């Protein structure tokens, strides 16, 4: 078998990306952001505290004749940004872009944090990193791709994330014709639970390549790209009046700038990120002060290849007994 679902962006900012999800039957369609650094599928609910739902649509698995409770389980989940979420869990059918999962743990919420309820494009999280992550208690669950694994057609997904653009999740199969030239293939550790690899390098702009070992997560349910406070200070460097500002959290720059590109090596390989992919606007609405796009990864304890990073390629998430990662120009 085989899915593929196009995901949306859910603002002009490409904040994160909104996918479709069926759950239930008959089907209940939810906006999911799909999420490869965690490994929980939450989403709001009929269960969830009323105050806490602001204009989301909610998963009620009294309507749904294929739900059950699994009895016992409860969920607790806080995630890099400081968010979190919990509740309990049911097994339900659970399809995107046409595959289908039955006895999938979908883990309704009780509670939510303020950033979910003020966020009302987002009816929850599809983790797609290792099911080892996934927080359910006392019986750890699956992710949706670890289930529908062995019934792919290959034991893959694909990320093409748009940039001010809609995109693709494909499930089982790669589409040659959604990149150019090759795809190139890196090592990934499972040892945290996350898609981990090692960058060979990077360039800012026109500038020469650095060749040094980045590890990393891919991460699609992350904005931005936060990287070694090195290599960020190198990119900052090359715009004129950028600095870090702890005000504001992080490295802003003249909204009249041009930014500079931002190159990434997989082995031998070269990802180009435009530097308009870099550019979150205004710090606040009316400002010529911008926030920018590449962040310090320090006192975060990882780097992470978030949005920016991930949407200048086409990305190969191969979960073969021996998993890697595929990155291809587009």
């Given at each position: 078998?085989?899915?593929?679902?196009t995901?949306?962006?859910?603002?002009?900012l490409?904040?994160?990306?909104?996918?479709?999800?069926?759950?239930?039957?008959?089907?209940?369609?939810?906006?999911?952001?799909?999420?490869?650094?965690?490994?929980?599928?939450?989403?709001?609910?009929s269960?969830?505290?009323?105050?806490?739902?602001?204009?989301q649509?909610?998963?009620?698995?009294?309507?749904?004749?294929?739900?059950?409770?699994?009895?016992?389980?409860?969920?607790?989940?806080?995630?890099?940004?400081?968010?979190?979420?919990?509740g309990?869990?049911?097994?339900?059918?659970?399809?995107?872009?046409?595959?289908?999962?039955?006895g999938q743990?979908?883990?309704?919420?009780?509670?939510?944090?303020?950033?979910?309820?003020?966020?009302?494009?987002?009816?929850?999280?599809?983790?797609?990193?290792?099911?080892?992550?996934?927080?359910?208690?006392?019986?750890?669950?699956?992710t949706?791709?670890?289930?529908?694994?062995?019934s792919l057609?290959?034991?893959?997904?694909?990320?093409?994330?748009?940039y001010?653009?809609?995109?693709?999740?494909?499930?089982?199969?790669?589409?040659?014709?959604?990149?150019?030239?090759?795809?190139?293939?890196?090592?990934?550790?499972?040892?945290?639970?996350?898609?981990?690899?090692?960058?060979?390098?990077?360039?800012?702009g026109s500038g020469?390549?650095?060749?040094?070992?980045i590890?990393?997560?891919?991460?699609?349910?992350?904005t931005?790209?936060?990287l070694?406070?090195?290599?960020?200070?190198?990119?900052?460097?090359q715009v004129?009046?950028?600095?870090?500002?702890?005000?504001?959290?992080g490295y802003?720059?003249?909204?009249?700038?041009?930014?500079?590109?931002?190159?990434?090596?997989?082995?031998?390989?070269?990802?180009?990120?435009?530097?308009?992919?870099?550019?979150?606007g205004?710090?606040?609405?009316?400002?010529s002060?911008?926030?920018?796009?590449?962040?310090?990864?320090?006192?975060?304890?990882?780097?992470?290849?978030?949005?920016?990073?991930?949407?200048?390629?086409?990305?190969?998430?191969?979960?073969?007994?021996?998993?890697?990662?595929?990155?291809?120009?587009?």
């Amino acid at each position: 078998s085989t899915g593929s679902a196009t995901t949306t962006p859910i603002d002009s900012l490409d904040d994160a990306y909104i996918t479709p999800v069926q759950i239930g039957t008959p089907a209940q369609t939810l906006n999911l952001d799909f999420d490869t650094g965690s490994s929980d599928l939450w989403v709001f609910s009929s269960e969830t505290t009323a105050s806490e739902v602001d204009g989301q649509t909610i998963y009620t698995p009294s309507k749904s004749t294929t739900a059950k409770l699994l009895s016992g389980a409860t969920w607790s989940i806080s995630y890099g940004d400081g968010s979190s979420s919990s509740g309990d869990v049911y097994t339900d059918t659970v399809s995107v872009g046409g595959l289908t999962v039955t006895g999938q743990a979908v883990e309704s919420a009780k509670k939510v944090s303020s950033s979910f309820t003020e966020d009302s494009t987002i009816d929850g999280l599809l983790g797609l990193a290792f099911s080892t992550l996934n927080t359910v208690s006392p019986t750890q669950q699956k992710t949706f791709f670890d289930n529908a694994k062995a019934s792919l057609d290959s034991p893959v997904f694909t990320a093409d994330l748009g940039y001010h653009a809609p995109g693709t999740y494909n499930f089982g199969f790669i589409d040659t014709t959604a990149y150019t030239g090759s795809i190139t293939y890196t090592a990934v550790s499972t040892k945290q639970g996350f898609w981990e690899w090692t960058s060979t390098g990077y360039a800012v702009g026109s500038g020469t390549f650095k060749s040094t070992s980045i590890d990393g997560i891919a991460d699609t349910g992350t904005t931005l790209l936060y990287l070694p406070a090195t290599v960020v200070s190198a990119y900052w460097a090359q715009v004129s009046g950028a600095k870090s500002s702890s005000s504001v959290g992080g490295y802003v720059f003249p909204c009249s700038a041009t930014l500079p590109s931002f190159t990434f090596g997989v082995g031998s390989a070269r990802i180009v990120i435009p530097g308009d992919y870099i550019d979150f606007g205004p710090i606040s609405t009316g400002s010529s002060s911008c926030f920018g796009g590449i962040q310090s990864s320090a006192g975060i304890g990882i780097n992470i290849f978030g949005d920016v990073a991930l949407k200048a390629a086409f990305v190969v998430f191969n979960g073969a007994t021996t998993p890697t990662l595929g990155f291809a120009s587009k």
